[PDB]
Amino acid sequence: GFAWWAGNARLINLSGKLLGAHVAHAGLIVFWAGAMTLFELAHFIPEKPMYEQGLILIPHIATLGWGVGPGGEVVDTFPFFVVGVVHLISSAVLGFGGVYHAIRGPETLEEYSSFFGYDWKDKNKMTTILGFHLIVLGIGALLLVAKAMFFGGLYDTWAPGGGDVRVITNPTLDPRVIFGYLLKSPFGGEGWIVSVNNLEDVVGGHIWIGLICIAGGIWHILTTPFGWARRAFIWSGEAYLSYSLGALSMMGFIATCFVWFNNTVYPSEFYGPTGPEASQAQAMTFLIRDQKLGANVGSAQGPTGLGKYLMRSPTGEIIFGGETMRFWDFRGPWLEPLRGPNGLDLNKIKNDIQPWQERRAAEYMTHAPLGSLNSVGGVATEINSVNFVSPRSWLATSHFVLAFFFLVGHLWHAGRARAAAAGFEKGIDRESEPVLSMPSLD
Amino acid sequence: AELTPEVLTVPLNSEGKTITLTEKQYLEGKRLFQYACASCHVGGITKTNPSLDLRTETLALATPPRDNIEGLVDYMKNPTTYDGEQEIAEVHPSLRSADIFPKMRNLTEKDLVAIAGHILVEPKILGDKWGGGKVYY
Amino acid sequence: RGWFDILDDWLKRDRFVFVGWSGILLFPCAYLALGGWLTGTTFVTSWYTHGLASSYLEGCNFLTVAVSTPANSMGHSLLLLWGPEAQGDFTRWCQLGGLWTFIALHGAFGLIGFMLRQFEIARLVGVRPYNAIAFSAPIAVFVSVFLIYPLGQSSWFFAPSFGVAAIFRFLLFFQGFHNWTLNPFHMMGVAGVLGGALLCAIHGATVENTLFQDGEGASTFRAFNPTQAEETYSMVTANRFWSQIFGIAFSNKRWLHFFMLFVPVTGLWMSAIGVVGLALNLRSYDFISQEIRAAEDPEFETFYTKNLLLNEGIRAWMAPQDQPHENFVFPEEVLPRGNAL
Amino acid sequence: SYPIFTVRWVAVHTLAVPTIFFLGAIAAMQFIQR
Amino acid sequence: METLKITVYIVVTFFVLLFVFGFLSGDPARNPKRKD
Amino acid sequence: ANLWERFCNWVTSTDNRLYVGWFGVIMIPTLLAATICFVIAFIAAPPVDIDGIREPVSGSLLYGNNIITGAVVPSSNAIGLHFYPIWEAASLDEWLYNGGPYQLIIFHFLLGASCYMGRQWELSYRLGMRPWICVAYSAPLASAFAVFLIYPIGQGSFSDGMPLGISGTFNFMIVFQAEHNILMHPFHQLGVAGVFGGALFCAMHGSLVTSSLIRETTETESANYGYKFGQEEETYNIVAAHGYFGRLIFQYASFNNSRSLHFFLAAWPVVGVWFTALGISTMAFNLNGFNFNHSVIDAKGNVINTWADIINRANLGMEVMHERNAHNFPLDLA
Amino acid sequence: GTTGERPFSDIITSVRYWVIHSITIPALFIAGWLFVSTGLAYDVFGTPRPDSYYAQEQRSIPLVTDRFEAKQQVETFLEQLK
Ligand code: CLA
Ligand code: CLA
Ligand code: CLA
Ligand code: CLA
Ligand SMILES: CC1=C(/C=C/C(C)=C/C=C/C(C)=C/C=C/C=C(C)/C=C/C=C(C)/C=C/C2=C(C)CCCC2(C)C)C(C)(C)CCC1
Ligand SMILES: CC1=C(/C=C/C(C)=C/C=C/C(C)=C/C=C/C=C(C)/C=C/C=C(C)/C=C/C2=C(C)CCCC2(C)C)C(C)(C)CCC1
Ligand SMILES: CC1=C(/C=C/C(C)=C/C=C/C(C)=C/C=C/C=C(C)/C=C/C=C(C)/C=C/C2=C(C)CCCC2(C)C)C(C)(C)CCC1
Ligand SMILES: [Cl-]
Ligand SMILES: [Cl-]
Ligand SMILES: [Fe+2]
C-alpha cells in the first residue's frame, strides 16, 4: 500500500529483490572508494602535504603503511593506484550480482532455497545471519592485525625520528588496558576510546574484537533468543533496520570526535593538525620567537596576571598560556620532548627546542582546521588567497550530519515498527478509539 | 585603471637598474606566491612573526636590501635575519632547504623572479593594504 | 449594464490567473518591483552611491548582488526618472540609485494591490477576510523598515538595500548602532516568529499523528476526501496526548487556528513599532543603573557591558567603509581593540 | 478546442521571455576577464 | 564531598536500573491494541 | 499483581494526570535538578570566571543584574572540556567561582529533554497514536544540543557554549558571527527560511481556516463556541478555503488534501531547523560561512568592495573586541 | 475543475509547441548573450568596466556628493578616465 516515494518499502517481503538492492548498493560504495581514490591520485602532487590537497582516502591508505616512509613522505604511489583499481573493478561484480538479483533473479528466495531464504519473524534464522556477519567482521578486524604484525606494519606518528612505518611485535593483550579505555570518561583529559595514543593498544584491541566477534558469531549461530529478549524487542524487518540505524548514528558521532581529536590513527602528517594541536602550536611559535629575542617566558606576567606564555592547569601542570589553556590535554610527537613530570619543562624550553620543532609548530599554526565553505583558509575575517580546508573539518562535519540524520531515521523507523507491530500505524480506528474508552483525566 | 607597464616596472638590483615584468609573469608569480608563501604571508604580512612584513619600505631596510628582484631571489635561496647576521634556511623556506620544505623543490630560477616580482608590484596596486593587516581588509 | 459593469464582468471572470479591479494596481507594480530587482542585480553598480560592486555583470554572486540605496546626498528624494536629479537620463538614474526608490515605491503599491486582491477574492467567493487581515503584518514590517526607518534618518541611504548580504549588513548595523537585540519590541517579534514556527510544526505533526484510519494503504494521504464532512484526525486523542505530555492542550479547534493567526501577526506588528522608534534613534541602548555602577566600579561586568564593547567594535571598524560620504578617517591608533587581535 | 492567446498566455511570457534573455546575459558573464 | 559523590552515584544507578528493567518488563505489550 | 508489576503499571499508566513513563523516570529528576539549580543560580550565584583569566562575570540578580542582563555564566576556560561536578571542587566556593552550576544545569537539562522526546514517543504508543511527534521535537532538541554541547566540544571549552541568559545569548550570537560568518552560511539561511516560512504558514493556515468557519453562532457570541470538543463534523469548509486561496494564487498552488497540508506544515520548519542545528553543529568544526572577502578586483588589481566586504568590516570589530583580555597571540584559533 | 485554458502538460508535450520554442528559447538566450558580449549592457546601465572603476593613479571613490549637481558630478568623474 506504499506510494512511489516510499517505494523501497515494497521490498520488505521480497527477499530476492531486496538482496539485489543491497548488493547493488554495496557496488556503489566500492565504486566510490575506487573512483575517489583514482581521482585523488590523478590530482596528487607529492611535494605538498596531503592536507593541502583535499585528500581523504589517500590518508587512510598511508596510515596503513603503504606508500610512505620516514616522516610521512610519500615514496611510492603505486599502492594507491592498486587500492583504487581493485575496488573499482570489484564494484562491477557487485553491480552485476545486484542488478541480476533485483531485476532477473527470483523475486523471493524462500521457495528457491531454504538456506538463503528468511522470514523476518524467524528469530533462529535471523540470529544465524547475524552470526555469519559477526564472523566476517571478526575476520576483518584480524586483517588489520595481520597487516600490522606480519605484512609490513603501520604508520607510527610517535616513532622516533619524525614518524615511520613500524611493525607491531607486541600488541597489548592486557584486558585492564584494552577495556580500561571503554571505561574512561568521555570528558576532557580522558576522552574515552578517542584517547588511544599508541599502535600497540590499537592492534591489541582489534585482536580482542576479532575474537569477541567470532565468539559471538558462533554463539548466535548456535542459539536462539532467550525469552527475556523475545519479550523486550520487536521482531520485524523495519524494527531490525531501526536498531542498525541507531548503531550507525552512535558510530558516526564517535568517528566525528575521533578525527577531530585523535592524532595517532589520524596522523597529523596526513590529515593536518587538530584544532587543539594548531592552537598549542601557535603558543609554541611565539614562545620560540620571543625567547630568541631575549624574553624570559617563565617569568613573563601577561595582562590578566596569568603568565603570558606559561601558566598552570587546574591540577598544577605547566601549560601554554592564553586562550589555549583549554587545550592542555593535547599530546603530540612534536611537543612531548618538552614535557617533564610537572608539565612543560622550563629548562628544556630554554635549551632544547630544535629547528624541526620550530618548523612543525609554524606549519601547524598556519594549517589550523578553520576555513570557509568555499575553501578560503583561516578565520572568517581573512582575505582570499589560501585555498584550504582541513581534512579534519570535512570529515568531522560530514559525519556529524550523517550521524544526526541516522538518529532521526532510527526514531522514525523505531516508532513506526512499534506502531505497525501493534497494528495502528495507519491511524486510529474510529470505532475503537482507545482514549474514548478511558476515563477522563478530570 | 589597468596593469600598465609602469606598474610592472620594479627595481632589479641596488644599482638602480629596472626590469619590466609582463602581465604573464605577474600572474604566474601571484599563483606561485599563493602556492608556496601565502600560508604565512597572505596579504604581505607574516603570520608567525608579525613584526616583519613584505612592505617595500621594510624590505628596503633589511640587510642585504630586499626591495629589488636580486635581493629577493637571493633571499629565496639563502634567507637571513633582517640584519643579515644569521642564515635561517632551516626555519624558512628556501632552495637551500628544499629538502625540509618540499614545495621549494620544483621552483625554477624564472619562478623565483616571478615571485619576487609579484611581491614588489603588489604594494603599488594595493598600497597600505599590502602588509597592513586586518585594519585595511 | 453600462461599460463599468461590462468591465467588472471581465475583470472577475474565472480564469487561471484571477485579475479583478485590484489586478490593475497589483500586476504592474508587482511586475515592476520584481523586474527592477532582477534588472539591477544583473546589470547595475553601486559604485557612485556606495563605492560597491553589486551586479552579476560586475562579478558578484547571488549572495552579494543588491539593488543598493541612493547616496546620502539625495536625502529623501523620490528620485523620479523625470526629476531634477536624473532629468530623464536613464543611465544616470540607475547610477544615482533610482532603482531603489523605483522598487520600494512600486513594491509598496504592490502590497496594497495584493491586500486588495485578498479582500476582492474573499468577497466574491464568500469567505471572511482574515487572510487579508493577517497580511497587514507583512505590510507593517515593510513600511516601517523600508520607508519610515529611512525617513526619520538622514536619507534613503540608511534603509535596507535589496540584496542578501546587503540585508545581513543591515542586521549587523542595527546591533552595533541601535543595540536592537536589547529592544523589547524586537524580543516580542522574535517570540512571535519563533512562536509561529513552533505552532506550525507542532500542529502539523499533531494532526498527522492523530489521523483516523480511513483507508487501508500505508500512505495515509489517500484516505482523505475534501468533501467529507468528518474530521480527519482525533481532536480528543490529540487533547489527551498534550494534556498528559505538556499539562495543557487545545480543546477548541477554532481557538487553535485563530491563535495561529494571532501569534506571528502580533509578533510582526510589535517589531514594526520598535523599528519606528529606531527611525528616531529612540533606542533601548543602555540600562542606566548598569552604566552608573560600571563607571564607578571597574570590577563589575555583565553580558550587557560585554556586548556594548562589541557594538563599539562594530561601529568604529565598519563606519568608514559603510558611510563613505562622511569621510571618516580613523588612524590605527584610535581603533578599539582588545589584546593581540 | 482551446484558445491559444489568453490572459494566462500573457502572464507566462511576461515572465518567461525576460528570464531566458537574462540567463543568456548571465551565462556570457562567466567569460568576462579582468 | 565523598559522601555527596557516593550519594549521587547511588541515586543515578537506582534510576538507570529502574529505566532498563522497566523497558525489559514486557513493554511492547503495554499498548491498547495487540498485546504480545 | 506483585509489587513490581504494580509499579510498572503505575509508571506506564494512562490514567495519571501527567504521564510518567520509563523515560519520565529519568526525565523528572534530571529536570528538577536543572530547574532548581538554575533558579537559585540566576538569583544568587556569585560572579564566575567564564574565560579563565580571573575576570569574573556577574550573572545573578543579587549581584546587580536584571532579567535581561542576568545569566548563569558558562564554566571556566581553565576547565575546558573537563568534567566539573561538585565533588571535584575543594569547596562550593571554588565550584561557584569556576562556573560549576552551568555544567550541572546543561547536563541534567540535555538528559531530561532527551527523555522528554522519548516520553513523547512512549505515550503515543500507550494511546494508539502514530509515533512521529517526537521526530518534530528533535529539531528544537538538536538545536539545544548544538549550542550547549556540540559547539563546546569542537572549540574545546564549555566557556564557549551558549550562556543561560538573554544578553548572554546575544553575546554568543555576535561572537559566533565574527568567527564563523554564520549569516553567509547556507544552513543558517535555511533555518531563517524555516522559521520565517513557518511563521508565514502558521498565519496562512490560521487565517484560511478562520476565514472558512461555518456560521454556527450569532454576532454577540465568540465564534469559537460554534465548535464543541469532540464533535465529529469538521468546523470549517476546506473547499471554500481552497476556492479562495487557489484564486489568490492559482488553483494548483493550493491544497485540497488536509493530510498533505498538515504534513507540509510539520515538515517545513522541522527540516529548516534541522539544518540550522546542523549549521551550528558543523561550524563547531570550523567549516564556516562563505568567504567572498576581496573576491572582486579591477583590471589593475584594486579591490572593489561588495556588501560581503562590509559584512567583513563589522565582523572585524566584533573579533578584535571580544574577550578583550583573553588573547596573547595574534590568531584566535578557538 | 478547469477554467478553459489548454492544459500545460498537453502544450509542452506537443510537436507544435516545441517547433516554435526550439527557436524562441535559444534566440532569446543568444540575444541576452549579445547584450553583454557586445558591451551594450555597460553603456545602457552605466556600469563600470573592469578598467574604469578608478583612474590609473587614483584610489578615491567617485562618490556623488551633491543632490542637484549629481548628474554632472558623475559625468565629471567619467571624463577623468580619458
Ligand atoms: C540504512 C539506511 C536506511 C534504509 C535502508 C531506509 C529504508 C527505508 N526508509 Mg528510511 N530513513 C533513513 C535511513 C534509511 N531508510 C534515514 C537516515 C532517515 C532520516 C532522514 C530516514 C527517513 C525516512 C522517512 C521519513 C521515511 C523512510 C521510509 C523508508 C522506506 C522507504 C524508502 C524509500 O522508498 O525511499 C525512496 C527514496 C527517495 C524518495 C529519495 C530520497 C531523496 C533524499 C531525501 C535526498 C538526498 C540527497 C542528498 C541530500 C544529496 C543531494 C545532492 C543532489 C544532487 C541530489 C524504506 C524501508 C519511508 C517509510 O516509513 O517506509 C516504511 C518514510 O516515509 N525513511
Ligand atoms: C541505491 C538505490 C536504490 C536501489 C538499489 C533500489 C532498488 C530497487 N527498487 Mg527503489 N528507489 C530508489 C532507490 C533504490 N532502489 C529511489 C531513490 C526511489 C525514489 C524514486 C525508489 C523508488 C522505487 C519504487 C517506486 C519501486 C522501487 C523498486 C525497486 C526494486 C525493483 C525495481 C525494478 O523493477 O526496476 C525496474 C527498472 C528497470 C528495469 C530499469 C533499468 C534499471 C537498471 C537496473 C539501471 C542500472 C544500470 C546500471 C548502469 C547497470 C550496470 C550493469 C552492470 C552491473 C553489468 C529494486 C530492488 C520497486 C519495488 O519495490 O518492486 C516491488 C518499486 O516499485 N524503487
Ligand atoms: C551476499 C551477497 C549475496 C547473496 C546472499 C547471494 C545469494 C544467492 N545468489 Mg547471488 N551473487 C552475488 C551476491 C550474493 N548472492 C554477487 C556479488 C554476484 C555477482 C557475481 C551474484 C551472482 C549470482 C548469480 C548469477 C546467481 C546467484 C544466485 C544466488 C543463489 C544461489 C547461490 C549459490 O548456491 O551459490 C553457492 C556458492 C557458490 C557457488 C560459490 C561461493 C564461493 C564464493 C564465490 C567465494 C567467497 C567470496 C568472498 C567471501 C567475498 C568476496 C572476496 C572479495 C572480498 C575479494 C543465492 C540466493 C543464483 C540464483 O539466484 O539463481 C536462481 C544465480 O543464478 N547469484
Ligand atoms: C552486531 C552485534 C550484535 C547484535 C545485534 C547482537 C544481538 C543480540 N544478542 Mg549478541 N553478541 C554479540 C554481538 C551482537 N549481538 C557478540 C559479539 C557477543 C559475544 C560477546 C554476543 C553475546 C551475546 C550473549 C551472551 C547474548 C546475546 C543476546 C543477544 C540478543 C539480545 C541483545 C540485548 O538484549 O542487548 C541489549 C543490551 C542489554 C540488555 C544490556 C545493556 C548493557 C550495555 C553494555 C550497557 C552499555 C550502554 C552504554 C551507553 C554503551 C557504551 C559502552 C559501554 C561498554 C560502557 C540480541 C539478538 C542474548 C540472547 O538472547 O542470546 C541468544 C544473550 O544472552 N549476545
Ligand atoms: C537496481 C536499481 C537501481 C540501482 C542500480 C545500482 C545501484 C547499480 C549499480 C551497479 C554498479 C555498482 C555498477 C558498477 C560498474 C562498474 C564497472 C563497469 C567498472 C568498470 C571498470 C573499468 C572499465 C576500469 C578501467 C580502468 C582500469 C582497469 C585501470 C585504470 C583505468 C580505468 C579506470 C579506465 C536503480 C537505482 C538505478 C533503479 C531501480 C533499480
Ligand atoms: C578495537 C579497539 C579497541 C577496543 C575496543 C573494544 C573492546 C570495544 C568494545 C565495545 C563494546 C563492548 C561495546 C558495547 C556496547 C553496547 C551497547 C551499544 C549497548 C546497547 C544497549 C542498548 C541499546 C539496550 C537497549 C534496551 C534497553 C536499555 C532496555 C530494554 C530495551 C532495549 C534492549 C532496547 C581499543 C579502544 C582498545 C583501541 C582501538 C581499537
Ligand atoms: C526596471 C525597469 C523596467 C522594467 C523592467 C522589467 C519589468 C524587467 C523584467 C526582468 C525579468 C523578469 C528578469 C528575469 C530574470 C530571471 C532570472 C535571472 C532567473 C534565474 C533563475 C535561476 C538561476 C534559477 C535556477 C534554479 C536554481 C538555481 C535552483 C533550483 C532550480 C532553479 C531552476 C529554480 C522598465 C522597462 C519599466 C523601465 C524602468 C526600469
Ligand atoms: Cl565577549
Ligand atoms: Cl591566545
Ligand atoms: Fe489545521
Author numbering:
A (entry chain C): 32 to 473
B (entry chain V): 1 to 137
C (entry chain D): 12 to 352
D (entry chain F): 12 to 45
E (entry chain I): 1 to 36
F (entry chain A): 11 to 344
G (entry chain E): 3 to 84
What does the paper say about this structure?
Light-driven oxidation of water to molecular oxygen is catalyzed by the oxygen-evolving complex (OEC) in Photosystem II (PS II). This multi-electron, multi-proton catalysis requires the transport of two water molecules to and four protons from the OEC. During one cycle of the catalytic reaction, the OEC consumes two water molecules; one is introduced into the cycle during the S2 → S3 transition and the second during the S3 → S0 transition.
At 2 F(400 µs), new electron density appears near the D1-E329 residue close to W34. The new water near D1-E329 detected in the 2 F(400µs) data after the completion of the Ox insertion at the Mn1 site may also support the O1 channel being the water intake channel from the lumenal side of the membrane. At 400 µs, W150 is not present anymore, and with it the last indication of a fraction of open states.
